[model samples]
Target chain A: GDSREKILHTASRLSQLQGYHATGLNQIVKESGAPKGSLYHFFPNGKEELAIEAVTYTGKIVEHLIQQSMDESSDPVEAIQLFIKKTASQFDNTESIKGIPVGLLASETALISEPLRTVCMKVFKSWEAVFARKLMENGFAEEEANQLGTLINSMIEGGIMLSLTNKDKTPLLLIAEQIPVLVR
Target chain B: GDSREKILHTASRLSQLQGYHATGLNQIVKESGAPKGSLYHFFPNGKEELAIEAVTYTGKIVEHLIQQSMDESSDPVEAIQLFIKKTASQFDNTESIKGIPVGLLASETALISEPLRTVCMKVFKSWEAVFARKLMENGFAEEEANQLGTLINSMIEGGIMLSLTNKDKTPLLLIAEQIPVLVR
Candidate 1:
């Protein structure tokens, strides 16, 4: 098995459960059963580099699926709800309650690593842009579409946090149901 | 100021910026300028015990302010927007140190200690209750008020994640702008 991919997956999984700062190189190696050499072979910048890459990698993949999911919807609101509902089920099924790749990172919402912060901003922007594109394609103007797109993204991320906190799906489902109305 | 109070204050502030696991006791003592002896003297059970009290203590204060802020307006939606707007500004200025609650511990790391878990759930439930109460005053059904309260609560948490991630206020302000309409 390729230890590099295993290490990456392990880090993301741990981050989802714990958070970037909460996770350590020791923990990742333990979870992945990968060697220190594998880690070094992939990343020269230690824990911070691995986390930056992991955060960006996951955000990109998630948004890619989200982009496609929104395409399946006929209206702007429909797109927002669809992305949330799909993720809601996955959240319910899995041990992790993550949606916004940066919610846990919000604690470090203060001054921290510059590189880590950069990836978070980029990850969020990437998702907002996707949702905005969906809205634009659905016939909304660029300005409102982007702004509302950002709102939808924010609510969904917030909603996921609530859902995870309560171990209940209603928080996110209710948000999904209401977002279309808010956008109008 | 009492050293105990200093430590508690530092713990809550630091934990807000970093999750429970990442915010170490060493950092807390260092920042608080309190001795290690004081930490053990106050928190006989160590870091987890300190965290339990810190989480509960800050949550009560936050809920108290949130409850009062909401009452400033008779309109339930207006109140929700007000609370978020107030928080958004603090987040923008860094003059304040509030952070996400039960919303951030999705990792199950700090939560291995049951007391921490109970406090987080209580914090979120307490918040939902206040938002629900306010919604009820504005002619919404009890169930609708509760559901939307949690959703509104979720979006605020989610919006915080977005704002913190981007180091911008737009995410929260956008959510605040849209929240009133969702309740209406």
Candidate 2:
């Protein structure tokens, strides 16, 4: 059980750092301190299965982080601002890692595997729902809220890409600044 | 000269249709009807060199497309709207071929090859400058315009990712609606 958990954790980290396709099974095994046999034992479907699990795990973590970031503020727009600020800060600290987890999957997983692709789509919809709920609370109509939610989520993903590509945090901060303007 | 142009055109088409890493040298050879030996002969640096050329090709195409889309609009917001509408329609008609060539490179080339990575960055910056000029023309201060240009570019990339993943044009359309609001 512990070995399985360790392998999943290591795979998630590697996938996040390098990407699903770029990270090899042997690297996951060595990083997780698990033997190749145990990896197959735990994930019989091989790296693809483990990748699905890893994507799901990261999705859960991202969901929890978004919830924690938005829970305190009374104003929905302010809560979104807090979310973006926290994300920008995290990216600032982690110099080597760029691109949001969802963005990475959105770009990489589609052609690789069906299960992984489904997980990515689920993750994106889940995050979009989070923003939708926030918008609803802010008094927008349900349909309008859903539209704004999708837009904000898309903007956040874009912000991460620009930040990563430029190797600077200014792009994220600028987009974050616009979130408040967007709400008003 | 004929073979070189064919290689670059084939590579651009492949990268736009599939992705950077997913499109192989063999596939490029087959698509271009060029011999395998010719690929290496023209691109001595191999796939990476070919990719750099492809990125430049995409950059020029995108720049021209932007110019054409916004050619008649004087209002910055309207220009942005026209750009988004044109892109969404293109993505729809072409079966979501309007993806981020840079996103593909960012996900793959950054760690795999330095030369290709630099070319991607340069291509992105050039695109950003194009948008920045529009933003400034619309009355945003220079720094703010550059930042918004980056943000808009990021959102388009993210929007394309979502639209492609979900196989629905709603995400792209929604982002399109929001772009005018963001600029206004």
Q: What TM-score does each of the candidates earn?
A: 0.90, 0.90
Residues A13-44, candidate 1, lDDT per residue (tens digit)?
77756676667788888998876754565656
Determine which window of 10 residues in candidate 2 chain B has minimal summed lDDT. B90-99
Which regions of candidate 2 are displaced past 4 Å? A37-44, A93-98, B41-43, B91-98, B111-114, B138-140
Write down the TM-score of model 1's second chain.
0.87
Clashing pairs in 2: A158-B154
Q: Per-candidate TM-score, first chain only?
A: 0.88, 0.89
Q: Global lDDT for candidate 1? A: 0.74
Could you tell me the lDDT of residue A5 within candidate 2? 83
Cα error, residue B59 of model 1, in Å, equals 0.6
lDDT of 1 by residue, B1-184 (tens): 4788888888887666667767788888889887775456565678877887778777887799789998889888788889989878866665564556445543344335657767787887788889998888778899988887787778888777777766677778888888757787
Model 2, A42-151: lDDT tens per residue?
Answer: 54678777787788888898888777777878788788888888778755654556445756655666655668778888887788788888778778888988777778
List runs of model 1 lying over 4 Å from the truth: A94-100, A106-110, B33-43, B95-97, B105-111
C-alpha lDDT values of all predictions: 0.74, 0.73
